[PDB]
Design a protein around this ligand. Structure first.
Ligand SMILES: [La+3]
Length: 75
């Protein structure tokens, strides 16, 4: 539940598919799977999360956008 682990695990998944410098639906999906499968139960579907996370329009859910989830994962 550490922060350093978030980066590590994150990259561990971001490196899974495509460049680890960018997250994806399938990529994040996995994370959201193990990382927080409960967040998947939310009313925010994968696609919803994907589009939700990306509020810039790059397609990459970099850790930056991820920090946005940490908020929901906090509440
Ligand atoms: La982005």
């Amino acid at each position: 539940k550490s922060p350093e682990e978030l980066k590590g695990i994150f990259e561990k998944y971001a490196a899974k598919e495509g460049d680890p410098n960018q997250l994806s639906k399938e990529e994040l999906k996995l994370l959201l799977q193990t990382e927080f499968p409960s967040l998947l139960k939310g009313m925010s579907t994968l696609d919803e999360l994907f589009e939700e996370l990306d509020k810039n329009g790059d397609g990459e859910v970099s850790f930056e956008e991820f920090q946005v989830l940490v908020k929901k994962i906090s509440q």
